[PDB]
Design a binder for this molecule. Structure first.
Ligand SMILES: [Mg+2]
Length: 76
């Protein structure tokens, strides 16, 4: 299925995923396609910080959903 990732500078990245992909897999796909190391990625959806070990279906992320991507240089 198709999901979208929006950045703070207003750009949209499209990903091909399955509901059983983990957030870790998604960050790895962003890194594959955009070079951003997963540790610098924060994905946000529906008022939640998303956690690497859970699945898209765990957050009811469906076809056509749009995640927010925030980059960080350190922890928090
Ligand atoms: Mg959405």
């Amino acid at each position: 299925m198709q999901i979208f990732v929006k950045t703070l500078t207003g750009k949209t990245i499209t990903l091909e995923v399955e509901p059983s992909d983990t957030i870790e897999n998604v960050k790895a796909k962003i890194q594959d396609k955009e070079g951003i190391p997963p540790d610098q990625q924060r994905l946000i959806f529906a008022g939640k910080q998303l956690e690497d070990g859970r699945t898209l279906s765990d957050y009811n992320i469906q076809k056509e959903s749009t995640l927010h991507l925030v980059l960080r240089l350190r922890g928090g």
